[model samples]
Target: GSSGSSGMWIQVRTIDGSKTCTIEDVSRKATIEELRERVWALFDVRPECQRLFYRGKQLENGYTLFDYDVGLNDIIQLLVRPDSGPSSG
Candidate 1:
């Protein structure tokens, strides 16, 4: 009962309200890195600089959008995570 067309639709906004993009039919299984690549292409920001949130929950890498239960037309917030430059964790 699932089709690729049934995938999620979403919009994103920067915390500063400077830029945005709306994506349609995104695969539920898409990884955070894939999404970040799209963000880099659409918003012209490096993937490493983006901190995405959905419904006030932080979106982490190695996770899928479905893992967060992200749904149609959901609004995602993008904050600059900033590259601290490969510091030792």
Candidate 2:
């Protein structure tokens, strides 16, 4: 519904490394489509097939973590494998 708010923990890791951050005073509220847009700024992952791991379960594509009742320190893992992608345009 295109909402907004504050206090989100977003961490991103690539084949090279990561940018760990506790995104405070921020908001991209309650939607997977929205989260995808917000996440792009922190990591290089695209939403197409990116997998986010949090709290022992793999996040489904296009669903808000909040909707799943995810908590802090959940450790959002951005799984990326270098050279595993198809080479094409």
Candidate 3:
């Protein structure tokens, strides 16, 4: 049989409160990197520039929303970096 469906909706907003968007049908197993891509499509903020926060903790790649205990309709804060390109190292 096919796997049962399970998903949640969440909100992403800018730190300055200038923009906000709801991401629907989000899988709990989806990684932070995937969510960043979604945010980029909606907010025009590049994935590299995105800093996602949930409940005061920073969200990192390779981690799922379930790992963060993000609930339905939860609001994730988005902070965009001032520098848009790769850093010199």
The candidate maximizing lDDT is: 3
> Per-residue error at 55 for model 3, in Å?
1.0
Compose the digit string of candidate 3's lDDT tens values, residues 1-89: 42328767888988779888999767767677788888888878778788888788887888887787778898888898886456757
lDDT of each: 0.78, 0.57, 0.80
Give me the overall lDDT of model 1: 0.78
- Which should have the higher lDDT, number 2 or number 3? 3
For 1-89, candidate 1 gives per-residue lDDT tens digits of 34575666678888778877886557877777888888888877788787888777788898877787667787789998665778845
Which residue pairs show collisions in model 3? none
- Poorest 10 consecutive residues by lDDT, candidate 2: 21-30
Show the colliding residue pairs in model 2: none
Preferred candidate (TM-score higher): 1 or 3: 3
Better of 1 and 2 by TM-score: 1
Q: Local error of candidate 3 at 68, Å?
A: 1.5
- Distance from true location, Cα of 34 in model 1, Å: 0.8
- lDDT by residue (tens digit), candidate 2, 1-89: 54554466655443234556443433334566666555655555566545566665777756666578766545577665455658758
Candidate with maximal TM-score: 3
**TM-score, predicted candidate 3 vs. hidden true structure:** 0.81
